[PDB]
Symmetry: D2
Subunit: 401 residues, 4 copies
Amino acid sequence: ANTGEMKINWVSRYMPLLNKIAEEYSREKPLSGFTVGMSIHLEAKTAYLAITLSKLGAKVVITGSNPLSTQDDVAEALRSKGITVYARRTHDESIYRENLMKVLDERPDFIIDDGGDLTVISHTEREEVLENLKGVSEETTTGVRRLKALEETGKLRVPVIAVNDSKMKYLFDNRYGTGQSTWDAIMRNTNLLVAGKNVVVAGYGWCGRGIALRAAGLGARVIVTEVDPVKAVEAIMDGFTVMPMKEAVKIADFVITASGNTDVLSKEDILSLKDGAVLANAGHFNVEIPVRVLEEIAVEKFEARPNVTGYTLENGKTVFLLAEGRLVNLAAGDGHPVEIMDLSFALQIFAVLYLLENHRKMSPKVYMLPDEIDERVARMKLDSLGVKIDELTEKQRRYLR
Amino acid sequence: ANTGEMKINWVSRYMPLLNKIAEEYSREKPLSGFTVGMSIHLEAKTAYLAITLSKLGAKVVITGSNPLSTQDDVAEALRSKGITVYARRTHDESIYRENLMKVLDERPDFIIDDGGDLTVISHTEREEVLENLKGVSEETTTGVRRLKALEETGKLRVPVIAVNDSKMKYLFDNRYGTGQSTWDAIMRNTNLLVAGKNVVVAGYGWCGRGIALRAAGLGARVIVTEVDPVKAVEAIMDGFTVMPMKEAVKIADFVITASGNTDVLSKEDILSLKDGAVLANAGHFNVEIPVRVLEEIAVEKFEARPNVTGYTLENGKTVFLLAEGRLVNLAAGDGHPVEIMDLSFALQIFAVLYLLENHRKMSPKVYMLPDEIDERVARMKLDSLGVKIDELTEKQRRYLR
Amino acid sequence: ANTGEMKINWVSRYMPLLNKIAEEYSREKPLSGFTVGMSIHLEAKTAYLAITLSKLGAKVVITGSNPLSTQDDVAEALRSKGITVYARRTHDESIYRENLMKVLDERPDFIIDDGGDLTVISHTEREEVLENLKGVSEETTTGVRRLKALEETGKLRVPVIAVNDSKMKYLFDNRYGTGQSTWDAIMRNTNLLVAGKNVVVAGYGWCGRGIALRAAGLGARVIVTEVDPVKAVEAIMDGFTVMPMKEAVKIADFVITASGNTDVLSKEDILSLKDGAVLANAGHFNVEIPVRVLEEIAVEKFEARPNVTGYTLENGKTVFLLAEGRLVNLAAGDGHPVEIMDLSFALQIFAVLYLLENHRKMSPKVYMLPDEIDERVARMKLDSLGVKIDELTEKQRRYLR
Amino acid sequence: ANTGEMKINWVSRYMPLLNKIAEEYSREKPLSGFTVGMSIHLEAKTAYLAITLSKLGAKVVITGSNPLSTQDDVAEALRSKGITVYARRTHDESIYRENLMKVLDERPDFIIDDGGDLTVISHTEREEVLENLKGVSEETTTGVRRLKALEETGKLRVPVIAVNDSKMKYLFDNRYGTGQSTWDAIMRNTNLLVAGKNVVVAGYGWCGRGIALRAAGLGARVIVTEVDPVKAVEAIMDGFTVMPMKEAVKIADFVITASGNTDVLSKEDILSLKDGAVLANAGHFNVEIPVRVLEEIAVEKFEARPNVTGYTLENGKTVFLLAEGRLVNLAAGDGHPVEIMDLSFALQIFAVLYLLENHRKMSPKVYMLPDEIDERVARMKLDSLGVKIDELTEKQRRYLR
Ligand SMILES: NC(=O)C1=CN([C@@H]2O[C@H](COP(=O)(O)OP(=O)(O)OC[C@H]3O[C@@H](n4cnc5c(N)ncnc54)[C@H](O)[C@@H]3O)[C@@H](O)[C@H]2O)C=CC1
Ligand SMILES: NC(=O)C1=CN([C@@H]2O[C@H](COP(=O)(O)OP(=O)(O)OC[C@H]3O[C@@H](n4cnc5c(N)ncnc54)[C@H](O)[C@@H]3O)[C@@H](O)[C@H]2O)C=CC1
Ligand SMILES: NC(=O)C1=CN([C@@H]2O[C@H](COP(=O)(O)OP(=O)(O)OC[C@H]3O[C@@H](n4cnc5c(N)ncnc54)[C@H](O)[C@@H]3O)[C@@H](O)[C@H]2O)C=CC1
Ligand SMILES: NC(=O)C1=CN([C@@H]2O[C@H](COP(=O)(O)OP(=O)(O)OC[C@H]3O[C@@H](n4cnc5c(N)ncnc54)[C@H](O)[C@@H]3O)[C@@H](O)[C@H]2O)C=CC1
C-alpha cells in the first residue's frame, strides 16, 4: 500500500500519454456507470492503466493474469483506490479461472482481456454477462487467434477490437520495446559482456530485428537464423551473417528465439552448443527453446542465478536457460519500458473509448484497430516529446490526390 | 561497340540472378518467336536485361527512354547482338514517341515499359498491336498509376503485372539501392565531407529511411522532416531529430527530398538555407525541390561542377542544386548498384515469364507481382550469396497452422 | 557460503583468462610462501581474483573496501577456501582503516590495493611491513596519483606497477565495460525507454565515447558536452550534437557525467533541467553532479526507487539522481561485466607475477604496466575467443624495420 | 584558367578554416618578402593552400608532385594569380627532380614538401638554398622518416615540423577522411553494392577503423585481419569478425589494405579469392596488394573500367584491382573530402607561421606539431560549425590541478 504506492508513483511520472488521456477526459468522465473488467499481468504499469480507466469514471475489476508474479503491495494499493482486484499467488491452475469467473460476476460492459480467456468463458459458460457485455479489446495474439475462430464459426456475438495489429504496436511493442527489455533482462540477470560475443537471433521479424539491432548496439557480432528467405536476405543487407541454426549454435554465446515457433533448437543443436551458452526466449510460449528436451537430456540441473537455470549435458558442457524458457523480458525483467507500455496502453484505452462511442454501429465481428487511433497516439506522443512536424499544404494535398 | 562491350562485360559479371536465369532457361528458350518491346533508360545495366531476355530466345526491341547519342557505344553493342534499338537524340518529345511508335511497329507480345507510355499509346492510338500484345509488365509508379486508371475505366484490355509492389523491390530498390546510390551520386559530384554535417531528409518512407540510414552511416547528424506523424515518431525512435522543414532548413548542409510530393521547400525556406547548402532530390519528378522557384528568385545562376548548378540569392547566400533537381542518383550517379538492379530486373524477367505461362488464364486487369516470385528471387539471391537458411519441419509446419 | 558459493560459481565460468592463468601456473604454484594483501570492493568477481591468486599458492588477505556493500555470504565462501578476509558492515569510517591495518598485521610480500590506502599506510605509519613488502600493484587513478606524489618526494621505497595505464584497460575498462555497465545500471533501476530520448554525456574521453556509443546503440539522440575542443570536434564527426551544458541541460532526458571533474552542473543548469530528468555519474567521486547543491536547493527529497532519489525544486520540477551521485554502474549495477573484469584482473595477476620475477631488478619507482603484458592478455583473449590472427613474416618484418 | 578557376571556386567555398586564416592575417601579410616552396599533388585543393599562403603575402613556388595527374587548367589558373608553378605531364622520372630543382632555384625561406624530396635535395646537393632556408614543414610519413634519419646523423641543419603527428590529423586525415574518400573512390569506380557483402579490411589502425566503420556504415559485413592482437581484440569488441587473411580472402567481396606493410596477400591468398573480388589499397605505396605478383600469375590482364584492371588467373577466376594497387582514394577518387583537406592544410599553414615566429629560437631538429596548434584548429572548426563548448571554471580548473 505504501510501497505499491511508490511503484506506481514511479510509473505514473513516465506515462505521458495516459496522463494526457487523464486530463482531457478526467472531467468529462465518459466511462461513468460503465464497469471495465480485465485479465492482465498485474504490476505497477498495468495498474496505472486500471487507475486512469478509473479516473475516466469506470468501475475497474481486475484479475491477476500472473498468479506467480502478483505483486501484493501493488494489488493492495489499487484496492485503496476503489478498484476490485481478484489476484492470488494461487500457483494452482484451478484458482485462475475462478478469479476470471469473479470479474464476470460483475457483468462488465467492456473487457480488455488476456488471450480471450475472459471473452471466451462468456460465450461458452456464462451468457448472463454476454448480454450486458457491450465490447471487447484484445491485445494478445493467442486471444485474437481465438476470438477469430469464434467470429468465423458465428459463435461470436460482441464487437472486438484487435489492437495487436497497428503499425504503432509493432513499432513500440515488437520492435523498440521487446528490443530494449530483452537485453536488459539478459544483462541484469547474468552480468555477462555483450560486446565481442556472438549473439544468435532465431527469427528476423519485428522482434528479431529489434533484438538484433539492439544487440549490434551493444557490440555483439550478430548471427541471424531464419526460415523465410526474404527476411534472411534482409539480415544480410543489414550487415549480419545468416546461417542454419545447426551451424550457428556451435559458436553462439547467447541464443535468442524470436520466432513464433517451436523447437527452434533440436537435441542435436543443444549438444553442439558450446559451454556457457546462455539461451533466452523472447517470443511465444515456453516452447521455442525445447525446455522439456533440456530437462531430459540433462545429466545435472541446478539454479545458478535468480533467473538462470543451468543444465550440464553428457558432453560435459553446461548450458544456461533464462526465465525457464519463458518470455525472458517479462518473467526476468520489467516487461517493456515504462513509456513503451504507456503507449501500448494508450492504444487500448482508446480502443475502449471507441467501443463506447461507435458502440451499437458495430456488428459482432473482430475489427482491427482503426487507423485513426494510431495517427492520434503518434500526434500525442510527438506532442509530449516537444516535436512539431510539417503540415501538408493545399498545393501538395492537391498534388498527391 | 568495343567500349559498350566492356561497359556490359563489367555489369555482366555482377548480375548473379540474371545469369542464373540465363542458364536455367537459356537451353529451353521459352521466349522463342515471342518478341519483347520495352522503353527504359538505356545503359550498360538495362542492356544486360535485354541481352538475357534475348538469351531466352526473345526478339528484343528497345527504345531509349533517355536522350542518347547516335553512336552511343552501348546501343551499338546491343545491335551487334541482334537487338533492335531505337535510341533518341533530342530533348523534345517529338522524337521520343516516334521511337515508342517504332517498337509498336514491331507488334510485340510482351512489354516491359516506362510509365505506361507504351501500353497507353497502344490502347489509345494503335490497337493493331493491342491484339497481338499478350502481356505487360510495369515497374514504375507513374505507369502503374496510369495503367490502373485504365483498368478502372474498363479501357484496359491486356493483363498487367505491377512489379513496383513486392517487399523485394521496396527492399532492394527503395531502401538499400537508392540509399547507397544517392550518397554516391552526392559525394562523387561534390567531394564534400558528410561526417559531422547536418543532413536533412524530407520524407521518411522506404527511401527516406534508407537515405537517412546511410547518411548516419557516413557520420552525418540526421534531421528528418515528415508529414505523417507515425513516420516522424519512428525517426525519433531511430535516434534522429525531427523538425519542420522551415526550421531544419536553417541548419542543413545537405537537404534531400525523398517524399513523393512537390515544393517540399518554399521561397521562404530557400531563403533560410545557409550559404553552401547542397540540395538533391531522390524522389519523384523534378518538383520536390522547387527548381522553377530557384531559377526566378536567383540573382545569379551558374554551373559550378559537372552536375552542380549554383544559385546566388538576394541574401547574398548561394545554394547548389544537384542534377537540376532531377532524381539525383540516376541523372548524376550510376542509377542503382549493379546487383541491386540485377534483382530489380530478375523480378521483371519472371514477371514476363509469368505472363507467358499463366497467359490466357489472366483477365485484362492489373495484377500485383505474385508473392511466389519474391520467394523465388530471395532463394536465388541467398543461393548465389552462399547462404543457407533453416527449412521448416513438420512439427513446426503443423504447429503454425 | 552456499549462496556466496554460487555467486562465485557463476562468475567462475565466465572468467576465461583467470582460468587460463589457473592452469598454466596452478601446478607450478609460483606464489607459495608469498602472501598477497589487498583492499578491494568485495563481491563475487573480485573474490574469484583472490581465489585464483590462492590457486597460484598465495596466502590472500583481503579487506572490504566496500563496508556497506560487503556481501556476507560471499565473504564467508572465501573463508571456507582458506582466505583471510577482514570485512564488516562497519559503516563507521574508523573500522575501515582498522581492517586495512589487519592485512598489514600479516606483513604481505605483494599488495594489490585501493587508492594507495594500503601502501601509503605502510610508508607513513607502519614501516614494519614496509620491509617484507616486495611489490605493489595499483589499478585505481587516485592511488597512482598518490603513489606518485611519494616517488617524487622520494618517500616511496618499493616498486609499484600502475595497471591503470595500458591500452587494454582503457579499452575494456573505460570503454566497453563502463559503457555497457553504465546503461545497464540505468535501465534496470528505472526501466525508462532510451530510444528516442535525448541523452547528454558530459565529457568525451574513453568513458564518454563508450557511454555515448552505447547510448546511440540504444536509440538515444546523443548530445555531448566537452571542455577540450579536440574531443568536441570528434563528437561532431561521430554524428553527435555538441553544446554547452547550460544549453543541453534544457532538453536532456538523461544526463551522465563522465568527466574527471566537479560541479559539471551548476545551480543554474539544475534549474533548467526538465521535469523527470534522470542524472547519473559514471566518472570520479560523487562530485561530478553537485549532490550537495541538489540537497540544499531541494524543496522536497524522497526515495522513489531502490536506487533513485528524487528532488523537487522551487520551479515545481522534480529531478532524479541514481546511486546518490556515486559511480552509477558500481553502486547501482554489478560493476563491470564479468569478462570485462576477468581481463582487468588478469592484468593485475600478471602485474603481481611480474613484481615477483623482476622483483629486485626494480627500483622504488612507479612503473607503467609493461607493454609485454598487454600483448599477452590480448593473445590469451583472442585464443579463448577462438580467433586466430595473421603472423608477421620475414619479408614484412624486414620491410617494416 | 576559366575551368581551373571554377575547380578552385568550388573548393574555395568549402575551406572554412583557410578562409578564416585569410581574413585574420590577410591584412597583416606576415609572409611578405618570404617565399614558400612546395612539392605537392597539384589540384584544386592543394592550389587553394598555395593561394591562401599567397594571400598572406608569400611568393609561392610549386612543383607538380603528380606528373601524371597535373591538371593543366588548374596550374594555369594559379599562374594567373602570381604563383610560380613548375608542373609538366613529364611522365619521365628525370623531369620531376628537375622541377624540384627549379623551386630551389628560387631559394625559399620555408618549405612544405613531399616525402622530404625537397629538403633532402638541399642538404645533399644544393647547400646554396640551405642557408636562406629558414624552416621546413613535413606532412607525409616517408618524409618524416627521412628527415629524421638526417637529424640522427646530424646532417640536418634546419628546424622541421612534422604535422603528420597530431591527434587532429590522425582524426581528420587518417580516420574520417580516408574513411569516406576510400569508399567513394570504390563505389564511383565500380558501382557495386556494398550492403550485404563481405568487406575485408587488412589492418585496424586509424585508417583500418575508419574504413571499417564506414563499410559497416554502408551495410557490409566487415571482416578484419590484423597482426597486432590488441587491435584484433578491439575489432571483435566493435562487432566485427577477425580471421587470418588466408581464411578471409576466400569469402571477401572487397579487400582493402590499410596496413603500412607489404604483400598483405600472397600468391596463395590471391588464388583463394573468389571470382569478382575487388581489391583496393588505401595505405602505403603500391606494395600492400602484390601488384607484381598479380601481373605475373595472370593468364589474362585487361582494363575493365577507367580505374579497374582485371586479372584472370589459372583457376579461371578473375580478380579486379582498383587504381593499379596505388592509394585508391587519391589516384581514383578526389583525395580526401574538401573540408578534411581544409583542416590538414590549416595545420600546415600554422606550422609555417610557427616556423616564422619561433624561427631562430628553434634548433636544427625535427619537432612534432605543437599541441597549441591542434587546440587552435579545433576551436576554429567548432567556431565555423556554429558549436560552442563549455569553458572550464576556476572551481574546476583548481580541482583538476
Ligand atoms: N518479448 C515480448 O514481450 C514480445 C514478444 N512477441 C512475440 O515474438 C514472436 C515474434 O514476433 P514477430 O517478430 O512480430 O513475428 P514475425 O512474424 O513478424 O517474425 C517471425 C519470424 O520468425 C521466423 N521463424 C519462424 N520459425 C523459425 C525458426 N524455426 N527458426 C528461425 N526463424 C523462424 C519467420 O520466418 C518470421 O519471419 C511472436 O511469437 C510474438 O508473440 C511479440 C511482442 C512482444
Ligand atoms: N531514387 C530512386 O531511385 C528511387 C526513388 N523513389 C521515389 O522516392 C519517393 C518516395 O519513395 P518512398 O519513400 O519508398 O514512398 P513512401 O510513401 O514510403 O515515402 C513517403 C513519405 O514521405 C512523406 N512526405 C510526403 N510529403 C512530404 C513533405 N512535403 N515533406 C515531408 N515529408 C513528406 C510521407 O508522409 C511518407 O512518410 C517516390 O516519389 C518514389 O517514386 C522510389 C524508389 C527508387
Ligand atoms: N564508472 C566506471 O566504472 C569508470 C569510471 N572511470 C572514471 O571516468 C572518468 C573519465 O574517464 P576518462 O573518460 O577515460 O578520462 P578522459 O580524460 O579520457 O575523459 C575526460 C573528459 O572529460 C572532459 N571534461 C572535463 N571537464 C568537463 C566539463 N566540465 N564538462 C564536459 N566535459 C568535461 C575532458 O575534456 C576529457 O576529455 C575518470 O574520473 C575515471 O576515473 C574510469 C573507468 C571506469
Ligand atoms: N589513403 C590515404 O590517403 C591515407 C593513407 N594512410 C596510410 O594508411 C596506413 C596505415 O595508417 P594507420 O592506420 O594510421 O597505421 P596504424 O599503425 O595506426 O594501423 C596500421 C595497422 O596495420 C596492421 N598491420 C600491419 N601489417 C599487417 C598485415 N600484414 N596484415 C594485417 N594487418 C597488418 C598493424 O597491426 C597496425 O595496427 C599507413 O601506411 C598510412 O601511410 C594514412 C593516412 C591517409
